[PDB]
Amino acid sequence: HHWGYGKHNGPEHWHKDFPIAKGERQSPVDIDTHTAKYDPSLKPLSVSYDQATSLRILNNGHAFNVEFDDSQDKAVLKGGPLDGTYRLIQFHFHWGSLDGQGSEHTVDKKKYAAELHLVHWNTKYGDFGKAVQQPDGLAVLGIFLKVGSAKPGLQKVVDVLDSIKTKGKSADFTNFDPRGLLPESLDYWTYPGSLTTPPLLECVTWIVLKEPISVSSEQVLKFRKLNFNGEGEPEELMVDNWRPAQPLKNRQIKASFK
Catalytic residue annotation: 62
What does the alpha-carbon distance between residue 137 and residue 135 come to, in Å, rounded to a whole number? 6
Residue 117 near Zn ion by CB under 5 A: yes
By beta-carbon proximity to ligand P9B, the closer residue of 44 and 56 is 56
Residue (203 or 215) nearer to ligand P9B, CB: 203
For position 181 contacting ligand P9B by CB under 6 A, the verdict is: no
- Counting contacts by CB under 6 A, is residue 59 touching ligand P9B? no
Decide if residue 85 touches ligand P9B (CB under 6 A): no
Residue 246 interacting entry, from Zn ion, ligand P9B, none, C-beta within 5 to 8 Å by type? none
Decide: is 169 part of the binding site for ligand P9B (CB under 6 A). Answer: no
Q: How far from 90 is each of 83, 131, 179, 206, CA to CA, in Å?
A: 20, 14, 13, 15
196 CB burial (10 A radius; 0-12, 13-18, 19+): buried
Nearest distance, CB of residue 89 and ligand P9B, angstroms: 7
Phi then psi dihedrals of residue 87, to 5 deg: -95, 135
Q: How far apart are CA 52 and CA 46, in angstroms?
A: 14
**Using rule CB under 6 A, residue 20 touches ligand P9B:** no
Contacted entry of ligand P9B, Zn ion, none for residue 182, CB cut-off 5 to 8 Å set by kind: none
* Residues 112-151: x where in contact with ligand P9B by CB under 6 A, - otherwise, as a string: -----x-x------------x-------x-----------
Residues linked to residue 146 through DSSP beta bridges, in sequence order? 214
Q: Which amino acid belongs to residue 222?
A: K
The reply, when asked if residue 106 is annotated as ligand binding, is no
Is residue 1 annotated as involved in ligand binding? no
Residue 199 binds ligand P9B, judged by CB under 6 A: yes
Long-range contacts of 247-252 (CB under 8 A, 24+ apart): 247/26, 247/29, 248/29, 248/30, 249/24, 249/25, 249/26, 250/24, 251/25, 251/29, 251/191, 251/192, 251/193, 252/36, 252/37, 252/191
Binding site for ligand P9B (CB under 6 A): 117, 119, 132, 140, 195-197, 199, 201
State the residues that interact with Zn ion by CB under 5 A. 117
